[PDB]
Every structure is written in C-alpha cells, then in structure tokens.
Ligand binder design. Structure first.
Ligand SMILES: O=C(CC1CCCC1)Nc1nc2cc(Cl)ccc2o1
Ligand SMILES: O=C(CC1CCCC1)Nc1nc2cc(Cl)ccc2o1
Lengths: 323, 323
C-alpha cells in the first residue's frame, strides 16, 4: 500500500475569490463532476489534501481545495473577530455565490471540521453532504460555557495558551522548519507535551531543537509549509481559537436543530486532542450519520493514512453524496 | 428584449493556470455542470463574454471564460512564435490537463473561433462539442498559400498591415479610449475603412479623433478594455496574425481529416470581415454540423446581439453537447 499520487504546486489551477473587499479566499481546483470543497485545519493548508485531491478528482468529483482564511494565499485580516465562526461560515456561502454553486459537498478536518459542521447546521440548502475528519459534532450547551469546558479536559490548556495574542505567535514563527517538523508527526513519533503548555512556558520548550523528519512527510513538503507561513504568519491561523464567546452564542441560536443531510464522521484512533470517543453520541443529532474509523491514525489524518482516507471518502461520496 | 445579465469583474472567480514556465493563462469561472470553455477573439478579452457567461451558467453549465494568451491577466511573451496555432492549441490541452478535465465544449469567436476549430481537428478526445461565432472552418489548401489568399480579398489588406511588428501597435496603443470606442461598434455605426489600410497609413487615420459611444457598449465597459490593454499592450494580441507560414504547414498535417464531433457555426449577417458566405461549404468537412445565424449582427457578435447568441448557444448545448 505505497503512498498514492500527490500534488505539485506549479501544476495546479489556482482560483481566487473575494467575498468581502478585504477578504480573498484562495484555492486549488481539479476534476469534473459534483463539487467537493476541502477545508483544512490548524495550522495546515490546502497542501494537507494533496493525497485525496487527485483521487477525489479521479473518482469523478470536482475538487475545490480551500486555502482557508488566514492561511497562505488567502487574505489575513489581523482582527480576531474576522475569524469567529459566523464570519468564516458566511464567507463560504459567499464563496459559493461568486462561483455560482447552489450546493457543494463539504469535507473538513480539525478547524475546517468544525467549520463544515456549522455549514451543515445553518446552511443545509448549500451543503449536499457533510464529512468531518477527527472533529466530532458537539451541540453547544446553553448552561455550560467554554470557560469551564476547556478547563475540564487537561489537554485543552494549550488553547488557553493560544488566547493571548502574540504569545504563541512568537514561538510558532520563531523556527518554521522546527515548528512544522515538530508538529507533523505520527503519534508514536510525538514530542509535544500537550499536558501543561502554560506551565512549561510554550509548546516547544520541552522538545528537540532539531527534531527528525517524520516518516509521514518529506523535507520538501515541510519546506512548502514553511514558505507558506512566511507571508501571513500565525496571527490569522491562531485567531480561529480566539473567538470562543462569539462561537458559543452564535451556536446557541439553533438549539433543537439537527443536521439532516448525509453526514460522515471519521474518527482517528491515535489522535489524542480529538479522541474518537468525543463523537460517541453524534448519532442523536444526526439521524443520517454514517461512520468511519482509521486504525493507527494520528491527528494529521491525511498525511498519516492517505490510502485509508481516500478509500473511506470515495466510497461514501459515491453512495450518499453523489446521489 | 432588454440586454441580459452581465458580469462585474470584482465579483468573479479568477482562476490561473501555468502551462509552461513562461506562460500563465487566466480565466473567470462560474456555474456547475459540463465544462464549457469560452475563447474570445482579437482584440477582445474574457469580458466580451459577459452576457453569455451568466446565462450559460444559468442553463446548467460550468463556464471557463478564457482570457486568451497575450490578452490581459494572461502572460504575454513578446516572441511572435509564441502565438502560432500549434503552440496556442497545445497549451489549451495542457490547460485541461492541469484542471483535470478529460473533455470540454469549446466555443470561440474570431481568433478564438479559429482556435476552437483546430482544437476539434487535432484533439477530438479533448472536445465534447465545438461552436464558432463568425469564423468558419476552411481546410488549408496545400497548393495555395496565405500569400495569394490574403491578397485575393481586398478587406484582408489590414492583416498585411499587421504583419510588420510595432507598426500597428503604436497606433492601437496611441489612444485606448479612441481605439476601442472606434472598434466596438455596430455595423451601421462603423468608421473603419477596411479598404486600403496600408495606403491610408493606418486603420484610424480616416476616423474621428473622438468617436461617439456605440449603442452596444457603455463608457465603463470601454474603460475596462482600456485598463486591460495597459499591461501587455497589443504586441501579443497582434502576434496571432504574424504566424501564417506556420499555421499553414501545421494545418496541412491533417489533409483528408474531418471534424466529426457535434459542431455549430454561427454566421452574423452584417459582419464584413467574416462574411457568412465564407462558411458556405463547411457542411462537407463537418457531417455533424448544425447552423446558426443572427440577423442585424455585426462582428462583435456577443455585444451586438447578446439575447440572440444566448438563445442559440443554450439551445444547441442542451441537445448536442450536454449529451
Ligand atoms: O483546536 C483544535 C480543533 C478544534 C477543537 C474543537 C473544534 C475544533 N485542534 C488542534 N489543536 C492543535 C494544536 C496543535 Cl499545536 C496542532 C494541531 C492542533 O489541532
Ligand atoms: O482576424 C480576424 C479573423 C481571423 C482572420 C481570418 C479568419 C479568422 N478578424 C478581425 N480582424 C480584425 C481587425 C480589427 Cl482592427 C478588429 C477586429 C478584427 O477582427
């Protein structure tokens, strides 16, 4: 099961779409057939889709690989508010408007996973079928705020560390080769102590200055993600985490609402931040849910087990999405 | 029959695709469904499609409005050779490669009409159905060269005037407001003496310094085509006309070949350079030919009779192309 076909940057079709005067979302496009929009997570890029991009096109689908707001080619407005769920979601609909797409299958991962879930909650007419990698669908509770929730689970302390503007940026921007080589790694090859990131005084303080090259990614691929963040940097990508109050209230404006479109949740066994058990009760709010699970898969789902992901995604699109 | 919906530049999806290191073709994209590539003529732009673009999308087609090599956003290599039929055609296939499109309906006009005809002759597997506006399909004759052909018909003397590099450029670039206001006009509103352009010492020498605003186009639209040519200029656009020897030989490499894919020729009654009678015998080389004709239509077919064009195009796509 060797690694499948990838994507070379200068051999892609780069599309650009302004959805607001100051906001221009970029993307890569390949294939013909039902539109399938791919949204990455933090701190990825459209590149993290390089294995499923050509395969999805191959299966008979149009692939719009999103370069999510703040990341890379896309616009990066320094304002925190420009990254609250509401704005980001609304711009996606606008993205479809400009392209003249009535609907589109939305497949996200990590933050993009959160993104595509709400894009299925508040804009069903716009989403054909929704699929999420690692990120489960938890309906915001009215009585409990992110305050005592992100402080309930010990791993989430890294997020409180992210809240403060500029702190996590200086570190994350300090060494891009290291930062990305340290991050993109299979579970068994970890280094990050998502235990006490605040007490440690950073997320890399307890790690090698020159980590090795993970078995998942090559040197070149790491260099691509390096040149990518040399533009906007991290303030944008990190801002997604900084709008918790807003995302909370906005999500309460739906309460007894359920996702009724074809949905598929893909749990990754070895992911410690987004553990497969968080999606346990999803079946309730999504009566039209189909499951997926990848063994020996870490957080970076696409880079980790590319052949598995493409097998599950394609099989699900052709039956539930494709119609 | 008021003028149909148009296209606003900043509200479009601008895609870019490099097909050679030094060549990057731009385009606008709108709609979902069978891919339909629109190619303009000289000296137009993707904008000349503004009326059929949203309509074609509306009818259920994906619209790739090409910003043809040399014009506007696209790369403009000063070398003449970079505009010979062969190169231009080959890059289009490469354009499909990069986007991952096995086939695409090709609709051209003027030079793009010549373009899409050869793209149907030498690359059938790549063209679903071909349609040309004004430009008929004349199979290059082995015995007769463009020498005594472009010198047979009196109107074509403007082309011999184009051959010399830089001559027609200085004039065409001299006043873009005038140049384009003088050009984009209905037949009854002419000014251009395509009689003796060489003896006159130019194509505008015998015309008003401040021509009026044609009933077809607004001031803004003229200003768009003005800012467009403020980049590359005209050397590129004019170079298309400068590769006659090559286009001749290259076209001889097919002789007894016929276009067998669904084809549609649209003749425009009032066009004096591309008279509807030039297409008379096309029926022979194209056994699968369907006809179209627009009354009171000048050379600028799309701007002139936008409601007619969209009626013919759509009706033909849904039956022959769409499959
Ligand atoms: O923060 C998220 C995603 C959200 C959790 C709830 C909804 C989506 N995951 C997440 N936090 C990361 C930290 C690092 Cl250093 C690297 C990758 C990460 O992915
Ligand atoms: O150049 C063509 C058509 C091709 C050459 C013969 C068949 C295809 N027509 C053509 N020559 C023009 C000159 C000016 Cl100044 C303006 C518009 C023109 O359209």
């Amino acid at each position: 099961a060797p690694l499948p076909t990838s994507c070379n940057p200068s051999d892609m079709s780069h599309g650009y779409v302004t959805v607001k005067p100051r906001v221009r979302l970029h993307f890569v496009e390949l294939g013909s057939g039902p539109a399938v929009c791919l949204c990455h997570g933090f701190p990825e890029s459209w590149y993290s889709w390089r294995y499923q991009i050509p395969a999805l096109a191959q299966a008979g689908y149009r692939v719009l690989a999103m370069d999510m707001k703040g990341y890379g080619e896309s616009s990066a407005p320094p304002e925190i508010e420009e990254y609250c769920m509401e704005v980001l979601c609304k711009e996606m609909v606008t993205f479809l408007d400009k392209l003249g797409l009535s609907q589109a299958v939305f497949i996200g991962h990590d933050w993009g996973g959160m993104l595509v879930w709400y894009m299925a909650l508040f804009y069903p007419e716009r989403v054909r079928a929704v699929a999420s990698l690692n990120t489960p669908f938890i309906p915001a509770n009215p009585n409990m705020s992110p305050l005592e929730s992100i402080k309930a689970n010990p791993v989430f302390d890294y997020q409180l560390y992210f809240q403060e503007p500029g702190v996590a940026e200086a570190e994350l921007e300090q060494n891009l080769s290291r930062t990305f080589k340290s991050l993109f790694r299979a579970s068994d090859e970890s280094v990050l102590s998502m235990h006490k990131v605040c007490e440690a005084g950073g997320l890399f303080v307890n790690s090698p200055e020159e980590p090795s090259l993970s078995r998942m990614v090559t040197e070149e691929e790491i260099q691509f993600y390096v040149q990518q963040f040399k533009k906007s940097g991290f303030r944008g990508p990190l801002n997604w985490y900084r709008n918790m109050e807003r995302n909370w209230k906005w999500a309460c404006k739906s309460l007894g609402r359920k996702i009724l479109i074809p949905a598929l949740m893909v749990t990754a066994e070895k992911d410690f931040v987004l553990v497969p058990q968080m999606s346990q009760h999803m079946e309730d709010w999504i009566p039209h849910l189909k499951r997926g699970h990848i063994e020996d898969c870490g957080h970076w789902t696409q880079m980790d087990k590319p052949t598995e992901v493409n097998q599950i995604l394609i099989k699900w699109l052709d039956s539930d999405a494709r119609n």
